[PDB]
Amino acid sequence: SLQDAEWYWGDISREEVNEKLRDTADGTFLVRDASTKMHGDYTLTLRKGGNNKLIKIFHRDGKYGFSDPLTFSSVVELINHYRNESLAQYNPKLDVKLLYPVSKYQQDQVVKEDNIEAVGKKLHEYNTQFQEKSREYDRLYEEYTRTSQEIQMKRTAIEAFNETIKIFEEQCQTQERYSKEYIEKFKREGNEKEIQRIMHNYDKLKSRISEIIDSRRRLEEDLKKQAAEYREIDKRMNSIKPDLIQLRKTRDQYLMWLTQKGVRQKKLNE
């Protein structure tokens, strides 16, 4: 029967099946009743070439197929025929067989007694564990971007310190270029007074250059330390992501026990 088949999921959306053939191997397959929501009309989707290639299953006189010449009695006969041999005799550029299905209940990972507390208690537990970890992930990404911008603000500030220090160093190298032989002249004229005016200003020049040089390393220190705490926030998020994804799926598929009955009462308590 088609109604009970592994690979017939029913009225799934294109986005929900795209989410299910993600990164899958060539040959994974899945069929829906067409999104056009018309009775007895179906679409096949399988993975080939990193793409989800859709094919329409035409229906006429109770027969089935996906081409104008139409043959098969049921979709299960149409599909199992191409689980066996290559579909390349039709639309020949693709050739992979209908290898691997994905099914609607072959992953109901509920362990023990099927009491309803497996939903009314264990679902509320995972969903609580999910929103807590999702709140931490969002908080991480907030201070992650905050630390990211405060870093480039410091990187440009030290880069500015570099230009100010470059301009003060050239000032010292021109102070010695144009004062060297004025010192040597005041030396033999016995004018220690003027020599100490020049030196008093030189000492003041390379006294302030030391202040901004210190201001730079003091900022480079804050950058080194904030840059490291940024890397930590990164690896922490990368550690939280696969966990957050794992217990999201677990929370999602524990609605199976809720969908088994198919009415909101057992979540309506929450």
Binding site: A160, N162, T164, R197, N238
Partner: protein, 999 residues
């Protein structure tokens, strides 16, 4: 701040001055002292220091210092104040000036405009960057030559372009508000040195041109002068050529011969039933305020291989190693890099990965081999890759990503070793690859860097010239019908995101030659091409070379991320530059800017088209600048948009002077709000208010915030501040409510005051897109004849979570109006309080008009919000004017909060719609109210393709609401595009009767 870590300078500070001799002089100088004053007093004080004998004359030097942008800036413009220099530290180095002064002064002004120094571009190694800077300067001279052509008129047409609808053809409901096909309009004339003016009322055809309006006015005044037919002509000739018309209260002018009813101001005066007030103004006065503005070429402007189709080998790439990967070695098992070869969003071949590797040693040295023949590569092929971790069940995650163009902008195939820094993976994305992301290396330092090597084929390899591509098509093509006709047309009807199966696409590829009879099919046919086959691609190139032009609303789809081929995109651009009006360009400019992110290279037909238009029309140029400037913080496009902004500012003429006055205004406001956001957040509301008024009363602030143009609409001058009425607001991020006087000579005829909200802290680009989308729906309904009045108020993002919002005068929230009423039920507000307040503000005959306006506007927002999934709004998110017009606000707030009702239709609204009746859902007012909703719903569904394209073009924005096409699928549900009309209509009715709950 005026100094690093300092908002304002004290009134007097010490400045370390470095002389050409190695003396250092401390100069105490006023905060406001101009550099001319600094230099003259410095060399006046220098005579007190050694070695003054070596100093040349004061005039032989300028100042150079380091700005807070880390730029060594030469201060050629010595007229600036010490505090405007944006100095990093308070010091000045004296040097002899070198280079062109005028260029240096102009570059600094450009740096302030685009928010980054122009000299940072001079340092870029990339040849693509330097070629772009030089190769679009001809687009600049094209534009300047064109607008300087017929001076002064051509120059006025650039600064004050006609604001007109795209078609003069009025719809019936607009034409019906004309007095037997005519409009009554008043002409004003300032007539006194004191400014005393006068008015002349006219009744004229709606389709008269401005020169004919001036003829009827001078004809009406010369009524009793006893002029001969020819004497009347001469003075009509005198005034037609000597005066032009201006809108009273703003800077809009009627400079070309569109019919009067096509100018938007007057199309609305008819639509709203208001009086068009115009001012007759001298042309020599208008041309006086258009100072001549030149354009000079900058300094940088002036100063063997084999084909891809000969390479007999499959594609392979070597992935070497990674660096700086941040991963917890004890929580994560191993890492591997994933790769794929893409053309847009469709893998050209199956993905392949490296082997998994310890986190402590990211090194592979693997040659990844791809199932694609090198000649089969399309030009727009891209390598997309990421580094992925893995953690019982096995589950993977991406750590960082990066995309690469297999061909560069010179058409050459990449070869040799390559190393690119990867980008962070965006919030909420689990896909292991990000193909829609930009192509390029992340400039931020200490980020995961990945190294590769591309095969080297003994020489440089280039993509084949178009010459041989067409011959390969002639080679492969050698290797009517009826019922098929109706299906092909049946496929053009389906939306851009409709499901297209294999049988349908190769059926299109089979009848690809018949498709040119239904050009609307081109996007569907292009997705049908097997792009990893050089046979089909070549055959397809020949089809698009001769494709009939499709209209812009369809051509824009071919600029989105699913159509990366340069020939396809080139065809789309040519469609726009020959069918897209400046009106519709100005509307769609939001989308058209951000499809530039999908452009593979800097220099492309699309940017040259938008840049050409921005330099020949100063209205679209204004928002062209701000939408680019608003994204400068984003490092994925800071360079592309930066280079593009440089060119625009270098050729937009005198308007750069005005733009910088806006930038400075926003830079002052963003500073005050940043202060209130952190330095004073810890203090009271009244304390913040007292700091505001004190800070705003300062002269430098008033001189920067008074007398500039409104970025929301440069036609609005912003004059003096009504400090009387400006204030902070109760919102948590505490924005500023600002009020300016309208300095127009006749401001009293439009508005005497202009009120705007400035919000620093909230992402406004959602409200922009939503308010824009609402304006599209309103324009559709109006063109169809549905007089549903929406209020897409002005809203402009200018940067990272900062922008402006237009205040709607005489408007209140439904929450405020409920608080004006009283309680009826147990603690329940009175549902009739809304209807009562409306009657208070609208007494007598005008009541019915207010009810009709409410019912029409309400119907519009019900349909709009439902389709866009903005259903449940707080009663403080809904607003209504005294006018009776209803509208919504704070759309981003709604999206930011959503991380049950289809649309808000509370009893309060139902009362006023039914004019206060019992069982209001069974009256004939409600009967024709939901008939408006139904017509409006299917009216939008008829245009569903346009909206889906507009949102598809925003995917690269980085708006978390638009990360994948799956996000856009919601609008296919609300519009029920996988169902027919009567099915969609029944779906919408079903939904509204859940908003009413069926009682």
């Amino acid at each position: 701040g005026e100094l690093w870590g300092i908002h304002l300078m004290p009134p007097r500070i010490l400045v370390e001055c470095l002389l050409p001799n190695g003396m250092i002089v401390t100069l105490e100088c006023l905060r406001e002292a101009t550099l001319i004053t600094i230099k003259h007093e410095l060399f006046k004080e220098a005579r007190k220091y050694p070695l003054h004998q070596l100093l040349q004359d004061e005039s032989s030097y300028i100042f150079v210092s380091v700005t807070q942008e880390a730029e060594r800036e030469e201060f050629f413009d010595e007229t600036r104040r010490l505090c405007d220099l944006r100095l990093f530290q308070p010091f000045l180095k004296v040097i002899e000036p070198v280079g062109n002064r005028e260029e240096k002064i102009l570059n600094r002004e450009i740096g302030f405009a685009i928010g980054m120094p122009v000299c940072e571009f001079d340092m870029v190694k990339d040849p693509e960057v330097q070629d772009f800077r030089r190769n679009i300067l001809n687009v600049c001279k094209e534009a300047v030559d064109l607008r300087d052509l017929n001076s002064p008129h051509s120059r006025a047409m650039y600064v004050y372009p006609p604001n007109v609808e795209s078609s003069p053809e009025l719809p019936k409901h607009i034409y019906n508000k004309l007095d037997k096909g005519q409009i009554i309009v008043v002409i004003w004339v300032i007539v006194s040195p004191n400014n005393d003016k006068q008015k002349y009322t006219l009744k004229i055809n709606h389709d008269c041109v401005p020169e004919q309006v001036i003829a009827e006015a001078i004809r009406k005044k010369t009524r009793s002068m006893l002029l001969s037919s020819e004497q009347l002509k001469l003075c009509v000739l005198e005034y037609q050529g000597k005066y032009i018309l201006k809108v009273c209260g703003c800077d809009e002018y009627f400079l070309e011969k569109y019919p009067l009813s096509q100018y938007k101001y007057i199309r609305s005066c008819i639509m709203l039933g208001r009086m068009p007030n115009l001012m007759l103004m001298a042309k020599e006065s208008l041309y006086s305020q258009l100072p001549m503005d030149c354009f000079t070429m900058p300094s940088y402007s002036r100063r063997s291989t084999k084909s891809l189709w000969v390479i007999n080998s499959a594609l392979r790439i070597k992935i070497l190693c990674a660096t700086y990967v941040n991963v917890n070695i004890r929580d994560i098992d191993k890492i591997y890099v994933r790769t794929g070869i893409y053309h847009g969003g469709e893998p050209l071949c199956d993905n392949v990965n490296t082997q998994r590797v310890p986190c402590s040693n990211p090194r592979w040295n693997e040659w990844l081999n791809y199932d694609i023949y090198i000649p089969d590569l399309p030009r727009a092929a891209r390598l997309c890759l990421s580094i992925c971790s893995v953690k019982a069940k096995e589950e993977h995650c991406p750590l960082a990503w990066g995309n690469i163009n297999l061909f560069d902008y010179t058409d050459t195939l990449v070869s040799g070793k390559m190393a690119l820094n990867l980008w962070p993976v965006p919030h909420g994305l689990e896909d292991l690859l990000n193909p829609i992301g930009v192509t390029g290396s992340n400039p931020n330092k200490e980020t995961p860097c990945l190294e590769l090597e591309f095969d080297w084929f003994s020489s440089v390899v280039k993509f084949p010239d178009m010459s041989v591509i067409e011959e390969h098509a002639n080679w492969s093509v050698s290797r009517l019908r009826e019922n098929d006709k109706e299906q092909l047309k049946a496929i053009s009807t389906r939306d851009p995101l409709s499901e297209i199966t294999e049988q349908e696409k190769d059926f299109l590829w089979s009848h690809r030659h018949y498709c040119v009879t239904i050009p609307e099919i081109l996007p569907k046919l292009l997705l049908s091409v097997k792009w990893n086959s050089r046979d089909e691609v070549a055959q397809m190139y020949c089809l698009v070379k001769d494709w009939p032009p499709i209209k812009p609303e369809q051509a824009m789809e071919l600029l989105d991320c699913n159509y990366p081929d340069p020939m396809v995109r080139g065809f789309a651009v040519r469609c726009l530059e020959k069918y897209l009006t400046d009106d519709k360009l100005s509307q769609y400019l939001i989308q058209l800017v951000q499809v530039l992110k999908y452009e593979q290279y800097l220099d492309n037909l699309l940017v040259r088209f938008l840049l050409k238009k921005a330099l020949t029309n100063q209205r679209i140029g204004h928002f062209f600048f701000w939408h680019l400037k608003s994204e400068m913080h984003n490092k994925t496009v800071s360079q592309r948009f930066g280079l593009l902004l440089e060119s625009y500012c270098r050729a937009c003429g005198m308007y750069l002077k005005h733009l910088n006055r806006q930038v400075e205004a926003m830079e002052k406001l963003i500073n005050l709000t940043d202060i209130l956001k952190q330095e004073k957040k810890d203090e009271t509301q009244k304390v913040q208010m007292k700091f505001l008024v004190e800070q705003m009363r300062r002269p430098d602030f008033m001189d920067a915030l008074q007398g500039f143009l409104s970025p929301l609409n440069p036609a609005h001058q912003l004059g003096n501040l009504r400090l009387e009425e400006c204030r902070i607001m109760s919102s948590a991020k505490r924005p500023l409510w600002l009020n300016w006087e309208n300095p127009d000579i006749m401001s009293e005829l439009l508005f005497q005051n202009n009120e705007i909200i400035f919000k620093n802290g909230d992402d406004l680009r959602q409200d922009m897109l939503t308010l824009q989308i609402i304006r599209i729906m309103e324009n559709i309904w109006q063109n169809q004849g549905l007089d549903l009045r929406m209020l897409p108020y002005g809203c402009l993002s200018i940067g990272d979570c900062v922008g402006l919002i237009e205040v709607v005068r005489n408007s209140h929230t439904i929450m405020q109006i409920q608080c004006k009423g009283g309680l009826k039920g147990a603690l329940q507000f009175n549902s009739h309080t809304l209807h009562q307040w409306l009657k208070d503000k609208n007494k007598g005959e005008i009541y019915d008009a207010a009810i009709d306006l409410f019912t029409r506007s309400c119907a519009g927002y019900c349909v709009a919000t439902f389709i866009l999934g903005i259903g449940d709004r707080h009663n403080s998110n809904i607003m209504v004017k005294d006018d009776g017009q209803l509208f919504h606000i704070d759309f981003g707030h709604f999206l930011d909060h959503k991380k049950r009702v289809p649309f808000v239709l509370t009893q309060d609204f139902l009362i006023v719609i039914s004019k206060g009746a019992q069982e209001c859902t069974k009256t004939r007012e409600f009967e024709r109210f939901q008939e408006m909703c139904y017509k409006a719903y299917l009216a939008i569904r008829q245009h569903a393709n346009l909206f889906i394209n507009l949102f598809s073009m925003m995917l690269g924005s980085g708006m978390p609401e638009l990360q994948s096409f799956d996000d856009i699928a919601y609008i296919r549900k609300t519009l029920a595009l996988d169902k027919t009309e009567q099915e969609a209509l029944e779906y919408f009715m079903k939904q509204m009767n859940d908003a009413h709950h069926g009682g």
